[PDB]
């Protein structure tokens, strides 16, 4: 399957090389290969997967927004017809974005999530699942936009339920999940009060648990807590 003939460990090794070379498409292809070997991923391996795809879809999203914005301007009063080109190219980028999202969601469904028993692995994958439906939701306008939104909410919510049960409030994955879910509420679900409440509660419970941490953990937790604070500053 492109990568079916390369060793798992070589795929991982090359994923790290690709990251150092800022070759995120290669990185993604390599970790896709790795995943398709059928073995569970270690913590570090989960991060490599996540980072690879986040960079790919991130480039796609930034491009989409640029084009979507040109498109919206062109469809204004006094704007001159330029032809179908802007919409065509926006659609091409969009199609390629969706393909990537479906690919990640595919890997999560076949079979990362059902094999993830530990809180840290399961929450990590459900977070990803919520993220990749959220990215689909950003560009969605059709019969199943709401279903797409609900798919995100549902993956996020299950992640949260487990995270609240199994992880301390300062757990970086719990924190990043809550950050992202609160962005979902604000940007996707039209629920800015939910967004603000989640971010606030998350920040305060974490604050109260920092005393239990080592210096290295403290640095990990406070970094994400600062992202929660930045959002709150913007939103309030």
């Amino acid at each position: 399957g492109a990568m079916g003939s390369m060793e798992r460990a070589s795929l991982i090794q090359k994923a790290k090389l690709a990251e150092q070379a800022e070759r995120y498409e290669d990185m993604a292809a390599f970790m896709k290969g790795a995943v398709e070997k059928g073995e569970e991923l270690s913590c570090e391996e989960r991060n490599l997967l996540s980072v690879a795809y986040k960079n790919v879809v991130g480039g796609q999203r930034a491009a989409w927004r640029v084009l979507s914005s040109i498109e919206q301007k062109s469809n204004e009063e006094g704007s001159e017809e330029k032809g179908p080109e802007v919409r065509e190219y926006r659609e091409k980028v969009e199609t390629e974005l969706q393909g990537v999202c479906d690919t990640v969601l595919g890997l999560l469904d076949s079979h990362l999530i059902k094999e993830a028993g530990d809180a840290e692995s399961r929450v990590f994958y459900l977070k990803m699942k919520g993220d990749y439906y959220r990215y689909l939701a950003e560009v969605a306008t059709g019969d199943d936009k709401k279903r797409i939104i609900d798919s995100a909410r549902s993956a996020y919510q299950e992640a949260m339920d487990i995270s609240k049960k199994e992880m301390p409030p300062t757990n970086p994955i719990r924190l990043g999940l809550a950050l992202n879910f609160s962005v979902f509420h604000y940007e996707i679900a039209n629920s800015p009060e939910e967004a603000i409440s989640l971010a606030k509660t998350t920040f305060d419970e974490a604050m109260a648990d920092l005393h239990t941490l080592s210096e290295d953990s403290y640095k990990d937790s406070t970094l994400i807590m600062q992202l929660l604070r930045d959002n709150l500053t913007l939103w309030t």
Binding site: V51, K54, N55, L179, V183, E187, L227, W235
Partner: peptide, 9 residues
């Protein structure tokens, strides 16, 4: 509104 940058591993 910032999500996890998650860009460097």
């Amino acid at each position: 509104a910032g999500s996890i940058p998650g860009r460097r591993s």
